[PDB]
Amino acid sequence: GSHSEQLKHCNGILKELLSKKHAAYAWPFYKPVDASALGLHDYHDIIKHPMDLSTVKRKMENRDYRDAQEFAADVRLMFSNCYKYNPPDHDVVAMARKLQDVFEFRYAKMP
Ligand SMILES: COc1cc(=O)n(C)cc1-c1cc(NS(C)(=O)=O)ccc1Oc1ccccc1
């Protein structure tokens, strides 16, 4: 209903995205993409605004999100970056779709 009640609900969503239940498809999103280590050609030229769950967690922990909409935008940016950069048949795209299914359903249940 209110900003704080909506933010509490978003903290609940983040907790689920970082739970053991979803870890089999969430782990590539736990930390920022390390383009050098992975040999991700032109990653930082194609992706202007990198995002990952550790960044979303740091922002939630410090109360940096003013509303639920800011939180949604960051999570969605993380999935959108993954779809934009990677080939459609890469395993990480399938993991991203799986985690996003979890996010979208819980975010839609926000009162
Ligand atoms: C191309 O890999 C990615 C592309 C991408 O858009 N995202 C968000 C994440 C990855 C990714 C990142 C790391 N390690 S990391 C966080 O950079 O330290 C490890 C595995 C990763 O995915 C893989 C999944 C299955 C097979 C191969 C890779």
Summarize the structure in short:
It comes from Homo sapiens. Belongs to the BET family. It is built from seven helices and no strands.
Structure description:
There is one protein chain. The protein has 7 helices and no strands. With about 110 residues, it is mostly helical. It has one domain (about 1-110): Histone Acetyltransferase, Chain A (Up-down Bundle). The radius of gyration is 14 Å and the shape is globular. It starts with a helix and ends with a helix. Bound molecules: the ligand COc1cc(=O)n(C)cc1-c1cc(NS(C)(=O)=O)ccc1Oc1ccccc1. The ligand COc1cc(=O)n(C)cc1-c1cc(NS(C)(=O)=O)ccc1Oc1ccccc1 binds near residues 28, 34, 85 and 91. It is classed as signaling protein/inhibitor. Keywords: SIGNALING PROTEIN-INHIBITOR complex. The assembly is monomeric. BRD2 Bromodomain2 with A-1360579. The protein: Bromodomain-containing protein 2.
Quickly give the CATH architecture. Answer: Up-down Bundle
**How widely separated are the two ends?**
6 Å
Main beta sheet, described? none
Q: Which series of helices and strands comes N to C?
A: HHHHHHH
Q: Approximately how much beta-strand content do the residues carry?
A: under 5%
Query: What is the C-level CATH assignment?
Result: Mainly Alpha
CATH fold call: Histone Acetyltransferase, Chain A
Number of helices: 7
Family: Belongs to the BET family.
Subcellular location: Nucleus; Chromosome
Protein name: Bromodomain-containing protein 2
Subunit structure: Homodimer. Interacts with E2F1. Interacts with (acetylated) STAT3; promoting STAT3 recruitment to chromatin. Interacts with CTCF; promoting BRD2 recruitment to chromatin.
